[PDB]
RNA sequence: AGGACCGAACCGACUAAUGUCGAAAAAUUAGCGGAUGACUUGUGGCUGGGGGUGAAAGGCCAAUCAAACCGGGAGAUAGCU
RNA sequence: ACACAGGUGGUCAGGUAGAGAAUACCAAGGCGCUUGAGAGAACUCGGGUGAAGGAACUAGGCAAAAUGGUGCCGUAACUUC
RNA sequence: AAUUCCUUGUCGGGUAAGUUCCGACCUGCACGAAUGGCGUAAUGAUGGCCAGGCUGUCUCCACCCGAGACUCAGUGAAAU
RNA sequence: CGAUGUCGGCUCAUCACAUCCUGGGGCUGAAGUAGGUCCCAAGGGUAUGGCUGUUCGCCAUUUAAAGUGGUACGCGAGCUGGGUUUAGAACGUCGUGAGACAGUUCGGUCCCUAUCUGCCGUGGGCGCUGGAGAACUGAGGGGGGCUGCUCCUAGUACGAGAGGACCGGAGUGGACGCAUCACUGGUGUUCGGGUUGUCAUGCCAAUGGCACUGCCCGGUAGCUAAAUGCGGAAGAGAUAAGUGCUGAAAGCAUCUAAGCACGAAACUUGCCCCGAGAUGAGUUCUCCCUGACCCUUUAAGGGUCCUGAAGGAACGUUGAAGACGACGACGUUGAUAGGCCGGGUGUGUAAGCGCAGCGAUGCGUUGAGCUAACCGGUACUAAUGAACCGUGAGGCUUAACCU
């Protein structure tokens, strides 16, 4: 009856659910921001950060553990290299979620999901 | 005989001296300080209100502060009331511990149970659930039949079928209590009670003594 | 945790190894019986040389369960079969002179004190 | 399953008393831009709490 | 605009 | 919470043997026949262990004469009294589950001797 | 060699569930029987209504069969509603 | 009758495992099946797991569960051999 | 007995308990020899019974994973 | 007869007492135990199986008992289609035959998205009249009320003996109901590991995808019972059957006519829960508002400006709360959620490197590595300043106290 669980169903399997946590985390980290919806956004908090988190210390095989999840060599090399060091001092909260209206194709509640970054 | 209010922590074991384990559970008992003494001159009879806890002043309301204002005490979580027994007499901000059951044994524990949401005949009235097999077609878990045939032709006022179940005051009596620590501000009783931890619980000396 | 239908061994050499528990005495509309209630069984199956046959109707008590039985400490001690020990109907007495296997100290309640002094452990 | 006698306009308008919509009655003006839009949520333009958070 | 398949009849006895 | 944790570590008992699972151990219990504080033994095979602080607990599987004896025990409870392992088994599972079936030859397990 | 065996294509529909204003005016799912023969299938023909055809159920004869469909006697008749 | 989970004859059919056109993953090639997003109540359908009992359920072992391949050993009553 | 009303005919086996089943007893309402009678190896998505294994069938359900049910946005019936 | 679904079974039950048990008594050819019969009493309970489609019935084993009836011989818009009662076929019999036989046997489509009444839950509006935040009283209503076994009394009373109590007290059980995971387990497709076939990361290695979570092994938190705690009461009032005291009518007698005392799981309370929409709308505490102008059919009237306080609502983070509503916590004067640190837990010695071995593989690093929902901390991120609703002292009459 869902007490005190967590993690969001998303009305999917969790073959489904796991594949494209692994390819919108890939897509956040490269873009380093993506529009979704904000459930979606809000269970991306806890996919993205433990990998940067991850990223926070580059050895051999953290970048293995790193190559296992998002399953592509050039988000494990956009991470330990430059994100790793820009998150080196913040202690969590890598992300930030800002809402953005609704979709106009089915009324579902957008959010902006990014880094706390882009100051450049 | 009048009860103090406390707080689920949970539960645990206390390992007895020959071997045998007592399931207890874990009610802490703060300072409950009485805020407003009922009398039979202005409210037909007596009782105590009391308070436990502790509130941030921001989230208190005005009518609520001005209410601890003059009892004297600090704003606490909710009020409480409890009948006095015609023995008892307190004043307004005198504060009650939880050494007043050191001398009791048997306690009665009051809170709101866990909340099972809408529940189903099975779950809820205990139903016994059809057969899985043999024919059957979508008529695992119904209640089945609700009434008889044309004579009364109405379903009767009480009858079990699905609904609300738990959140509710559920009390549990006569409960052995097996420690009060003082200093913890504890009080540790035999068995389970209802609500969750963290919950309110109102705690008083077993009535079927 | 012996209901209807239940296989049991038998524990003592009273001739049959093999029976079927058939009703759980003490009580009505009782379920399941313990590792000191009294049941009423009867024999599947028997040797030769036994004292009683195939298909004999009488009482017996359980010594064993695959369940366990809980002590007051919180530990359990479960067995890996269930085993009963045969009584004659009309006393409460066993039929056997040897007891195969351990017992419980459950089982000390002032009428199987035949049995826990035959037992060769516990 | 079906009905023994057709329903009113009573009967449909009375059921219908709990379908009519909500206003929102809560627009908040930007801190900079002093543009309106909902609460914790961005502008138009891509506006939150002064700070242009979208760049776009 | 079509018909209905018509209530399934049951098994009809006799004296 | 804290409050559950003061409560439970005056109650464990500090002197406990670290034991893995497949580690022949030896368990002393207390039983009482209502006047003889008896002192009784129990040495079998240890195929499940759980340690959640005063609720820990280990299971151990005893071949008796006959059939196997499966038994737990309350780790921080009075009743048992020593614990001292025998043998140290060499599995790499943390529950032995698998030994009920197995008897005789293909239930014994290696010496861990590291 | 086999109206041989197991078992795919193919043919058929024994059980259970779903479906019963269905995805479908008998289907799907999970199992099933035959699967070198009295097998199956494509194409083109022949046999027709008191007739054809029927390893025979009074089954089929264009989703309709103890006498198909269409048109005509015919606004048959109805002591019944 | 539908932009219909049905039916529609013939040809090619590759890699690995596999006896196999079974099956599992793939090449070539084509698609994600023309409403989506939330919540994770009762209840309905397809499933997975389970203490102890093991057909005591039921008209009925219905349904589920269970067996399942290759090589070798060995295989009863009866028989038209 | 696919046949027997009395009938759950009587005996034995199977089961703790068997209106079912099996082998007999003939007292065959109302079997019977090509509208064939009695058996019969093999065969059967055939009928009835029993035994082992197996299990949520059940004791007694419990949890979990999906598709609906529920909410929001769009389209939008029906029997009566 | 322009349709009232028929038996049996499953689930769900309701009511009556002509009461099966428990309870209270009268008579007994009631020594005790155990009974026979009758009266009061419906509060609770009132079997599992083999056969049969069967209700019923026979048998086996229990139980305190396995009650009788009504409710469309209760209940198919709750389930089955076994029997009966379609269309096929077969046996015995009847008839020349088509066919038929409360004679038998094999097999054989059980539809409906709830409009209203009813019931289970959960909300919105308004009212209770100045508004609001809390705590309550309590009308009334609902829930529950079952009992076995053992011991003491006491082997006492009784009884030739055999046997064997009433009363009272204590312990331990079955079923039922309530609550919760402290213990034992189950699940735990969000955690770890083993492993088969194939594909991919340019290749070894290491991984990932698919094949029911591919198949398994365990398993965090939650839920859950098979697990663990508690309950049925004691007592009081009024009584039924029944037992009585005194006592006339009727100089006696008499439980009754006056009066008075007992007397049941039956009634009301006592135990638990809901409950002021109890429109008879209740009680107590606390908080907030004490500004001016016109029109006037000068009335508890309407309109203008200035202020709209307490509080609520909305929004966001959310919950062992929840279908949606609703309830609860927090919103920077922060621990509400997410992230992070430490720990715990679970799985099991990660990757890489080095050594040994022809190789598979083994050892050290290493009880390592990874950890979900857990615990304790930490503003690193999101809970925005504000806006919205809600007003400006609260009607008439009478009585009592101060002016």
């Known amino acids: 009856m869902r007490h005190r669980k967590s993690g969001r169903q998303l009305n999917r399997n969790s073959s489904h659910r796991q594949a494209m946590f692994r390819n919108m985390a890939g897509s956040l980290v490269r873009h380093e921001i993506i529009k979704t919806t904000l459930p979606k956004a809000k269970e991306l908090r806890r996919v993205v950060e433990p990998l940067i988190t991850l990223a926070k210390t580059d050895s051999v095989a953290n970048r293995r553990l790193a190559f296992a999840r998002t399953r592509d060599n050039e988000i494990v090399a956009k991470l330990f290299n430059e994100l790793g060091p820009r998150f080196a001092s913040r202690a969590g909260g890598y992300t930030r979620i800002l809402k953005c209206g609704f979709r106009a194709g089915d009324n579902a509640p957008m959010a902006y999901i990014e880094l706390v970054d882009r100051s450049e | ?209 | ?122 | 399953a079906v009905q023994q006698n057709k329903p009113t306009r009573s009967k449909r308008g009375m059921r219908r008393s709990h379908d009519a919509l909500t206003a929102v009655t809560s627009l908040s003006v930007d801190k900079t831009s002093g543009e309106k839009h909902l609460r914790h949520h961005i502008t138009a333009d891509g506006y939150y709490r002064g700070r242009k958070v979208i760049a776009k | 605009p079509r018909p209905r398949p018509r209530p399934r009849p049951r098994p009809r006895p006799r004296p | 919470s804290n409050i559950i944790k003061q409560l439970e570590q005056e109650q464990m008992k500090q002197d406990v043997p670290s034991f893995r699972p497949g580690d022949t151990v030896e368990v002393k219990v207390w039983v009482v026949e209502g006047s003889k504080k008896r002192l009784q033994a129990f040495e079998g095979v240890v195929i499940a262990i759980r340690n959640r602080g005063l609720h820990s607990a280990f299971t151990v599987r005893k071949i008796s004469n006959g059939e196997g004896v499966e038994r737990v025990f309350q780790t921080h409870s009075p009743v048992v009294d020593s614990i001292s392992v025998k043998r140290r088994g060499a599995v790499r599972k943390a529950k032995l589950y698998y030994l009920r079936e197995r008897t005789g030859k293909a239930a014994r397990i290696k010496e861990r001797l590291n």
């Open chain 3, 1 to 122: 945790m012996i209901q209807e239908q239940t296989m049991l061994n038998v524990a003592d050499n009273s001739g049959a190894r093999r029976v079927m528990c058939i009703k759980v005495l003490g009580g009505s509309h009782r379920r399941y019986a313990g590792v000191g209630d009294i049941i009423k069984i009867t024999i599947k199956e028997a040797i030769p040389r036994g004292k009683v046959k195939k298909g004999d109707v009488l009482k017996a008590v359980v010594v064993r369960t695959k369940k366990g039985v809980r002590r007051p400490d919180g530990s359990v001690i479960r067995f890996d079969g269930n085993a009963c020990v045969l009584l004659n109907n009309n006393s409460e007495q066993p039929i056997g002179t040897r007891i195969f296997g351990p017992v419980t100290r459950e089982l000390r309640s002032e009428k199987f004190m035949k049995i826990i002094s035959l037992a060769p452990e516990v």
């Open chain 2, 1 to 209: 005989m009048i009860g103090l209010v406390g707080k689920k922590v949970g539960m645990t074991r206390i390992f007895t001296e020959d071997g045998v384990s007592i399931p207890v559970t874990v009610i802490e008992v703060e300072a409950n300080r009485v805020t407003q003494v009922k009398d039979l001159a202005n409210d037909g009879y007596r009782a105590i209100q009391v308070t436990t806890g502790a509130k941030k002043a921001n989230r208190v309301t005005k009518p609520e502060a001005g209410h601890f204002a003059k009892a004297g005490v600090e704003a606490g979580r909710g009020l409480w009331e409890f009948r006095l027994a015609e023995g008892e007499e307190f004043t307004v901000g005198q504060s009650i511990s939880v050494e007043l059951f050191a001398d009791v044994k048997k306690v009665d524990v009051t809170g709101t149970s866990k909340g099972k949401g809408f529940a189903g005949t099975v779950k809820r009235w205990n139903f016994r659930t059809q057969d899985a097999t043999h024919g059957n077609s979508l008529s695992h878990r119904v209640p089945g039949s609700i009434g008889q045939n044309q004579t009364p032709g109405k379903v009767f006022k009480g009858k079990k079928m699905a609904g609300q179940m738990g959140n509710e005051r559920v009390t549990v009596q006569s409960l052995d209590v097996v420690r009060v620590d003082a200093e913890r501000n504890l009080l540790l009783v035999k068995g389970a009670v209802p609500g969750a931890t963290g919950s309110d619980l109102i705690v008083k000396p077993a009535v079927k003594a």
